[PDB]
Design a protein around this ligand. Structure first.
Ligand code: ACD
Ligand code: CO
Ligand code: CO
Length: 120
């Protein structure tokens, strides 16, 4: 049921989320440059994209098995899973947007290369 996301999948999901959340043009400009402001508009966008990629569920949180499928082929699944699990936490402030974004920010600090490589 999980399918890995390609570059085109991700571009479609970006477009869909910009549409459905009515993301302002200024934010889109920033997302294109990999700039993600610390605000609800951005956080809900990332949640939206992750929902569509089947990498995050609003109730269960990060979908670790799916993240490993997305990121790890050709690499050491154990290493990747370990790095993912370091960024997996509880929904302590009962906010799926905050939750999804926190995990993204955690992971991309040290694993940006792995993220970019996953999108072929
Ligand atoms: C437990 C924390 C897990 C966080 C994992 C981080 C990223 C997901 C991993 C692989 C999927 C690849 C790209 C999606 C990443 C960011 C959204 C792009 C937004 C945009 O470009 O407009
Ligand atoms: Co797999
Ligand atoms: Co392990």
């Amino acid at each position: 049921e999980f399918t890995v996301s390609t570059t085109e999948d991700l571009q479609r999901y970006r477009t869909e989320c910009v549409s459905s959340l009515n993301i302002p043009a200024d934010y889109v400009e920033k997302f294109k440059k990999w700039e993600f402001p610390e605000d609800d508009t951005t956080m809900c966008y990332i949640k939206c994209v992750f929902n569509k990629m089947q990498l995050f569920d609003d109730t269960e949180g990060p979908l670790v098995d799916n993240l490993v499928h997305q990121l790890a082929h050709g690499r050491d699944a154990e290493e990747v899973r370990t790095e993912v699990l370091k960024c997996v936490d509880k929904n302590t402030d009962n906010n799926a947007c905050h939750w999804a974004f926190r995990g993204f920010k955690c992971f991309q600090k040290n694993n940006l290369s792995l993220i970019k490589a996953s999108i072929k």
